[PDB]
């Protein structure tokens, strides 16, 4: 089967948390890039699988950028998860409730929760919920990229990383996709 291991395919928010992620998950493969969307994460996931580089646990840390197509994008990436893997979906957070995309990001997070609740080989990492509980990391920010100063960047990054680490713990006794 697929070798154990974790690969995170992530967006600009994941990239901001890169140091905290690597500290919380030593030995995880963190592939986060500014421009990544759910659409391109799906492509990256399959390219890695096809080159035999994708380990068992796949963390998709996307959703806030280009959120309009969330239903099709999240349905597709779940459908395209290869056999042999467990998937962690990191919900997105747009904090500005007046942004024209806010309702879309909120619907995307809710839809991802539905996919995780119903699919035995998926676990949620509910950053959307965590972010809402910590207004202090959003003071002075663009409401997406946590922390406006050194201390709150570190604090927000730790919260982000710990959300994913906890999801990985929850996933430990769960099945992979199999036929
Ligand atoms: Na599940």
CA dihedral 80, 84, 86, 89 (to 10 degrees): -10
Strands 86-90 and 57-61, sheet pairing: parallel
Biggest CA-to-CA distance, the chain: 48
Tell me the CA–centroid distance for residue 86 and ligand 1, in Å. Answer: 10
| Whole-number Å distance between alpha carbons of 146 and 53 | 30
Is the distance from CB of 36 to CB of 9 less than 8 angstroms? Answer: yes
Tell me the CA–centroid distance for residue 136 and ligand 1, in Å. Answer: 30
Is the distance from CB of 9 to CB of 59 less than 8 angstroms? Answer: yes
Tell me the CA–centroid distance for residue 156 and ligand 1, in Å. Answer: 26
Other beta carbons less than 10 A from residue 161's beta carbon = 22
* Long-range contacts, stretch 40-44, CB < 8 angstroms, 24+ apart: 41/9, 41/10, 41/11, 41/77, 42/73, 42/76, 42/77, 42/80, 44/9
For the chain, the domains span 1-179
In the three-class reduction of DSSP (H, G, I as helix; E, B as strand; rest coil), residue 82 is classed as coil
Tell me the CA–centroid distance for residue 113 and ligand 1, in Å. Answer: 9
Tell me the CA–centroid distance for residue 109 and ligand 1, in Å. Answer: 15
Entry resolution (Å): 1.1
Is the distance from CB of 85 to CB of 122 less than 8 angstroms? Answer: no
Contacts of 129 (CB under 8 A, 6+ apart): 91
- Give, to the nearest 10 degrees, the angle between helix 70-80 and helix 38-50: 10
Phi, psi of 43 (to 5 degrees): -60, -45
Tell me the CA–centroid distance for residue 21 and ligand 1, in Å. Answer: 22
- Give, to the nearest 10 degrees, the angle between helix 70-80 and helix 102-118: 30
Is the distance from CB of 115 to CB of 78 less than 8 angstroms? Answer: yes
Handedness of CA 56, 130, 13, 41 (dihedral sign): positive
Name the CA radius of gyration of the chain, rounded. Answer: 15
| H-helix segments, the chain | 12-16, 18-24, 38-50, 70-80, 102-118, 127-132, 150-171
């Amino acid at each position: 089967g697929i070798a154990d291991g974790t690969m995170l395919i992530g967006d600009s928010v994941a990239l901001r948390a890169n140091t905290a992620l690597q500290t919380a998950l030593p030995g995880a493969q963190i592939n986060a890039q500014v421009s990544v969307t759910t659409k391109t994460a799906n492509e990256i996931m399959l390219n890695n699988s096809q080159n035999k580089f994708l380990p068992k646990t796949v963390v998709i840390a996307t959703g806030v950028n280009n959120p309009e197509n969330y239903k099709d994008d999240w349905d597709s990436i779940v459908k395209n998860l290869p056999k042999g893997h467990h998937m962690i979906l990191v919900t997105p957070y747009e904090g500005d409730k007046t942004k024209e995309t806010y309702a879309i990001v909120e619907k995307a997070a809710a839809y991802m929760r539905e996919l995780a609740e119903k699919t035995p080989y998926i676990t949620i990492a509910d950053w959307n919920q965590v972010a809402k509980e910590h207004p202090e990391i959003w003071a002075g920010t663009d409401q997406v990229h946590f922390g406006s100063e050194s201390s709150t960047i570190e604090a927000g990054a730790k919260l982000y990383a710990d959300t994913i680490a906890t999801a990985l713990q929850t996933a430990q006794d769960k099945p992979v996709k199999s036929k």
